[PDB]
RNA sequence: CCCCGAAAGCUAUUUAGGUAGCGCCUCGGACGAAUACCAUAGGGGGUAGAGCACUGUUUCGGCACCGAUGCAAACUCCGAAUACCUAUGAGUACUAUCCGGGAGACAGACUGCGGGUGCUAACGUCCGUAGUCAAGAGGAAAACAAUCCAGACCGCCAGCUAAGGCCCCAAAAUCAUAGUUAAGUGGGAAACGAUGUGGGAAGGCAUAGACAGCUAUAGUCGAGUCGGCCUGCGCGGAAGAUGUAACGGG
């Protein structure tokens, strides 16, 4: 006979692009994510596809905050 | 005489001996309990 | 500043790339070759990574 | 050319007689092979024969350990189909001890014309007497 | 023949059997237990045969607790077939056995009868066994 | 009174996986004693003594005296770890009584 | 004659033993430490393991629930070592990047580790990762591309060593100390069986006389002995065709 499987989708290259302690410029993308695994803090904007980008020049920092305990990424000038 | 890899005592009239590198079971009263090898 | 002698005791032909680079950074170039190096953590790391094919005289 | 090889013409072969009563076959055969090849002389040359003549007496008293006397098998094949013939140490020592010593020594000697020539210098006899009184052999304990 | 009533997926990967059994090595539902000492695979038919032997020989004078359940399907290609063309079909179910894994416990019968029955059962298993008893600590 | 286990001193160089395996090869069992009014104490015991004590049922309820040099600690057996297959004791936890 | 020195991958193709761009090689120019190894500092994770708090599944009990117990690539309340990114620094290495001229190559193989497929079969097949062969001689493994040691500029009848070895074929100890084996085990093969022999811990009994036997519970007998557990080395289980042929030989 034959098999009904044998299909897959092309890769999407998701994940973190700039790690904590690094330097960024305004407009640099920091996180590529399907959902909001990370949220935006100061000087970080969110795109329509949930991408996180930097709106200011500085140093990236990750943190855990809030009652929900969700993770935030921000830029320090 | 029964030749088998597993030879064991059957009754109290049996005896296990080793003759020239071969294990044997010999029974006094019963001549059918004779076992060889194993 | 103290110094330490290091001698290569085995071949490096079929070892890992980082291990060969550690030999190069220490300055060893062939079996039996001995060098004098400064006693610092930076050099000690390279020596420890290739401990199995070197001899250290303190 | 400062290193020199022995000259066959200048070689001297000395005669010795050995008694095999009570000794172990292989440990005797090793020494016999050494002396036949000439490893015991400072003039030893691989391509020259510098050994000594070795007579063996009381060859049928040679001994083996363990159960080898019964369980050591000698084979020989006639080139005809199915022609494999077998014997054991006790029968062979009773019948032809010379063959026992010949096998033991030829196994330990080199294989070639030089080896064949070297093995000619061994004389084996089952009795206590040998016919080589003229050569005046000396007693050697090995 | 024990088999899961329902399953999420029909076919599973082969995997590898390693490690020891730190869980399931303690007698907890009875007095006297039979425990494996090496690793392997135990089939449902083997489980049933061992249980039947033990029950027959103890004459249903106590309670047997079974602590192995086959939940891993196994597939084989039918026959006369070349390599490729997809995975095979399920033919039987098995359970992974690690050293220290308890297989059967007996409660309510005497030590001699229980041990002798376990001796009968061991002749059908594909791996070595040993006998243990309840203990305080 | 009933049980006086003779223990040694188990130090930092003797702690760790390699040291523990070496000790068990030398037929010794690492153990820990933890209780109030003091910090934990790491010790080593003898396998034969531990096995003999474990057989008795009163060992679990009665108080035990652990002797390390001049010091004596009155404790009770708190936990025991056993090899899954061979069943040999491997580690013991004692609580000061 | 001298110098350097690959690849058998990705993507696309009426494409699959062809070809094109990229990756890998070489030469020139420009440019030079902006590079690499290691140490320290900062950073994300959901794999090994483990667990049942979601999903599914399993057994035993008391009232869909509660107590106990077990499992999972497409389960997770958890969670490493490594690997990866960034900054600073000692030492050692003409490294890293750009522009241009010329290519070859796009049929790989074995082995170790993590896996799918297969029968936890194949010198089988398909991925990731490291080594060797390819394109690499020398020594060892009897003979043996892919295993171990090791990288051949030329000459020496000089010396020291690696893997492996020192009774003879054949270079070097019939070397030294303390034990084990009797099976030529060494020098092919399991479930299982039973006695061999060495070592360790424990237990029953005993000249108010046990234990094997022989005589009317006794005793004319006179000290060890009965039964087990954990371990070292051995034994049987073991049948094929050309000729000993399962230590290379002695
Ligand atoms: Zn009988």
Report how far residue D105's alpha carbon sits from residue D26's, in angstroms, rounded to the nearest whole number: 9
Q: Which residue has the tokens 């494999």?
A: D84
β-strand partners of F33 = F41, F94
- The dihedral built from the CA positions of residue A64, A69, A75 and A76, taken in this order, carries a sign that is negative
E38, closest residue in chain F (CA to CA): F85
Cβ pair D101, D29 in contact under 8 A: yes
Under 8 Å CB-to-CB from A48, ≥6 apart: which residues?
none
Buried/exposed D87-105: b ≥16 CB within 10 Å, e otherwise:
eebeebbeebbbebbeebb
8-state DSSP, A50: S
Question: Exposed/middle/buried for F19, CB within 10 Å: 0-12, 13-18, 19+?
Answer: middle
User: How many CA atoms does the CB half-sphere of D84 hold within 13 Å?
Assistant: 4
Nearest Cα residue to B1 out of B36, B37, B38: B36
Buried/exposed D25-52: b ≥16 CB within 10 Å, e otherwise:
beebbeebbebbbbeeeeeeeeebbbbb
Report how far residue E35's alpha carbon sits from residue E23's, in angstroms, rounded to the nearest whole number: 12
Phi, psi torsion values for E121, nearest 5 degrees: -65, -35
Protein residues within 5 Å, CB atom, of ion ligand 1? B 10-11, 13-14, 27, 30, 33
Report how far residue F21's alpha carbon sits from residue D13's, in angstroms, rounded to the nearest whole number: 67
Question: Exposed/middle/buried for E112, CB within 10 Å: 0-12, 13-18, 19+?
Answer: exposed
Looking at the complex, report in whole angstroms how far the Cα of residue E6 sits from the nearest Cα belonging to chain F: 32
| Structure tokens belonging to residue B26 | 């010999």
Report how far residue D34's alpha carbon sits from residue D56's, in angstroms, rounded to the nearest whole number: 15
- Going through chain B in order, the beta strands assigned E by DSSP cover 2-3, 14-19, 22-27, 35-36
Report how far residue C57's alpha carbon sits from residue C50's, in angstroms, rounded to the nearest whole number: 15
Report how far residue A20's alpha carbon sits from residue A25's, in angstroms, rounded to the nearest whole number: 14
Under 8 Å CB-to-CB from D27, ≥6 apart: which residues?
none
F61, closest residue in chain E (CA to CA): E136
Cβ pair B5, B35 in contact under 8 A: no
Instruction: Quickly list H helices, chain E.
Output: 44-58, 111-122
Counting one residue from chain A and one from chain E, the pairs whose CB atoms sit within 8 A come to 7
Report how far residue D19's alpha carbon sits from residue D124's, in angstroms, rounded to the nearest whole number: 10
User: Residue D32 belongs to what H/E stretch?
Assistant: helix D25-37
Nearest Cα residue to D108 out of D30, D6, D35, D12: D30
E-chain CB neighbours of A3 within 8 Å are 85-86
Phi, psi torsion values for E46, nearest 5 degrees: -60, -45
Cβ pair A53, A59 in contact under 8 A: no
Cβ pair D30, D97 in contact under 8 A: no
Task: Quote the ligand 1 centre to B12 CA distance (angstroms).
Answer: 7
User: Residue D123 belongs to what H/E stretch?
Assistant: strand D122-124
DSSP conformation letters of F18-67: HHHHHHHHTTEEEEEEE-TTS--EEEEEEHHHHHHHHHSSHHHHS-EEEE
F-chain CB neighbours of E39 within 8 Å are none
| Structure tokens belonging to residue D73 | 């098998």
Q: Which domain holds residue C10?
A: 1-57
Quote the number of domains for chain C. 1
F-chain CB neighbours of E127 within 8 Å are none
Report how far residue B20's alpha carbon sits from residue B23's, in angstroms, rounded to the nearest whole number: 9
Task: Quote the ligand 1 centre to B6 CA distance (angstroms).
Answer: 15
Under 8 Å CB-to-CB from F5, ≥6 apart: which residues?
F45, F49, F50, F53, F64, F65, F66, F67
8-state DSSP, B32: T
Neighbours of D109 (CB within 10 A): 19
Cα of D21 vs its chain's centroid, Å: 15
E85, closest residue in chain A (CA to CA): A2
In this structure, chain B runs to a length of 38
Do residue E137 and residue F79 have CB atoms under 8 angstroms apart? yes
| Structure tokens belonging to residue C30 | 């062939």
Task: Quote the ligand 1 centre to B4 CA distance (angstroms).
Answer: 16
- Residue E132, SS3 per DSSP: strand
Report how far residue A31's alpha carbon sits from residue A37's, in angstroms, rounded to the nearest whole number: 9
Do residue F85 and residue E100 have CB atoms under 8 angstroms apart? yes
């Amino acid at each position: 006979g034959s098999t009904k499987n044998g299909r897959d989708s092309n890769p999407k290259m998701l994940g973190v692009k700039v790690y904590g302690g690094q330097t960024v410029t305004a407009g640099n993308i920091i996180v590529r994510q399907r959902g909001t695994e990370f949220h935006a803090g100061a000087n970080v904007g969110m795109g329509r596809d949930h991408t996180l980008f930097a709106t200011a020049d500085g140093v990236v920092k990750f943190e855990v905050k809030g009652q929900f305990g969700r993770r935030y990424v921000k830029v320090e000038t | 005489m029964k030749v088998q890899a597993s030879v064991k005592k059957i009754c109290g009239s049996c005896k296990v001996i080793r003759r020239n590198g071969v294990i044997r079971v010999i029974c006094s009263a019963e001549p059918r309990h004779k076992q060889r090898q194993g | 500043m103290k110094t330490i002698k290091v001698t290569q005791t085995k071949s490096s032909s079929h070892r890992l790339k980082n291990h060969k680079l550690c030999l190069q950074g220490l300055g060893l170039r062939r079996i039996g070759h001995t060098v004098e190096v400064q006693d610092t953590p930076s050099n000690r790391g390279m020596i420890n990574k290739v401990y199995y094919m070197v001899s250290v005289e303190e | 050319m400062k290193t020199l090889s022995a000259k066959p013409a200048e070689v001297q072969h000395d005669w010795f007689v050995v008694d095999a009563t009570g000794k172990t076959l292989g440990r005797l055969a090793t020494e016999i092979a050494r002396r036949l090849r000439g490893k015991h002389k400072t003039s030893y040359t691989p391509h020259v024969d510098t050994g000594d003549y070795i007579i063996v007496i009381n060859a049928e008293q040679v001994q083996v350990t363990g159960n080898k006397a019964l369980d050591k098998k000698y084979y020989r094949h006639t080139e005809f189909p199915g022609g494999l013939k077998e014997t054991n140490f006790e029968k062979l020592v009773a019948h032809k001890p010379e063959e026992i010593f010949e096998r033991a020594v030829k196994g330990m000697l080199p294989k070639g014309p030089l080896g064949y020539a070297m093995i000619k210098k061994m004389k084996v006899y089952a009795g206590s007497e040998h016919p080589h009184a003229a050569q005046q052999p000396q007693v050697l304990d090995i | 023949m024990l088999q899961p009533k329902r399953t999420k997926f029909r076919k599973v990967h082969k995997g590898r059997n390693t490690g020891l059994a730190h869980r399931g090595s303690t007698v907890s539902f009875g007095s006297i237990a039979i425990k494996a000492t090496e690793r392997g695979r135990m089939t449902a038919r083997q489980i049933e045969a061992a249980r039947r032997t033990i029950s027959r020989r103890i004459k249903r004078g106590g309670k047997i607790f079974i602590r192995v359940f086959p939940d891993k399907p196994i597939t084989e290609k039918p026959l006369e077939v070349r390599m490729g063309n997809g995975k095979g079909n399920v033919e039987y179910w098995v359970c992974e056995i690690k050293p220290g894994k308890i297989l059967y416990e007996i409660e309510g019968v005497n030590e001699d009868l229980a041990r002798e029955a376990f001796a009968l059962a061991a002749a059908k298993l594909p791996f070595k066994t040993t006998i243990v008893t309840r203990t305080v600590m | 009174a009933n049980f006086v286990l003779n223990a040694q001193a188990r130090a930092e160089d003797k702690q760790g996986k390699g040291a523990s395996r070496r000790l068990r090869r030398e037929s010794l069992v690492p153990a820990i004693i933890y209780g109030g009014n003091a910090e934990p104490v790491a010790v080593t015991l003898e396998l034969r003594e531990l096995v003999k004590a474990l057989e008795s049922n009163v060992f679990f309820e009665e108080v035990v005296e652990i002797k390390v040099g001049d010091k004596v600690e009155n404790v009770k057996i708190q936990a025991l770890q056993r090899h899954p297959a061979k069943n040999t004791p491997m580690h013991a936890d004692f609580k000061r009584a």
